[PDB]
Amino acid sequence: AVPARHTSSAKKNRRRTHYKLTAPTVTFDETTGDYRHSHRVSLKGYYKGRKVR
């Protein structure tokens, strides 16, 4: 429960190694933008090439 000794900060970051965030795949400039994700909706209503608000 209660820790014994001090974490050395290098080992603390060695705990913090796998903790990182993962980039989501973003569809890039479509006309000149704007963006969606694949399997997701654009800001212009577009999923599967048709506007749905």
Partner: protein, 125 residues
């Protein structure tokens, strides 16, 4: 599957029992993906019961629907839209009887800025 919804089955049946009538009094609806998945199972088969216009079987659907006032108006005037019953089971479904099931389409809306909630739009056609 037929899942737990994060709510007591009282409120699964009940929250379901609200959102179905909401999703027919409005046309297409954006709410979250899990309740969208129970739409995907449930509201398909029970508006498929909506295809048959039995007064007895739609009376069994009278549990599934509830008393409403339309905003697809003018229900209050001469007849354009019904109540929750007895005409929209053709005003919708006459388009929908040649089709062999499969009346919603589900589209993954951009997730919500509240608590990172990915929510969706379901449509009926």
């Amino acid at each position: 599957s037929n899942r737990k919804l994060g709510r007591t089955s009282s409120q699964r049946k009940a929250m379901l029992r609200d959102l179905t009538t909401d999703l027919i009094i409005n046309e297409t609806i954006v709410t979250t993906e899990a309740r969208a998945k129970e739409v995907r199972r449930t509201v398909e088969k029970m508006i498929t019961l909506g295809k048959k216009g039995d007064l007895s079987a739609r009376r069994a659907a009278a549990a599934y629907v509830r008393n409403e006032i339309a905003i697809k108006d003018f229900n209050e005037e001469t007849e354009t839209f019904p109540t929750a019953l007895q005409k929209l089971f053709n005003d919708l479904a006459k388009r929908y009887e040649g089709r062999n099931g499969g009346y919603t389409r589900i589209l993954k809306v951009e997730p919500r800025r509240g608590d990172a909630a990915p929510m969706a739009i379901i449509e009926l056609v």
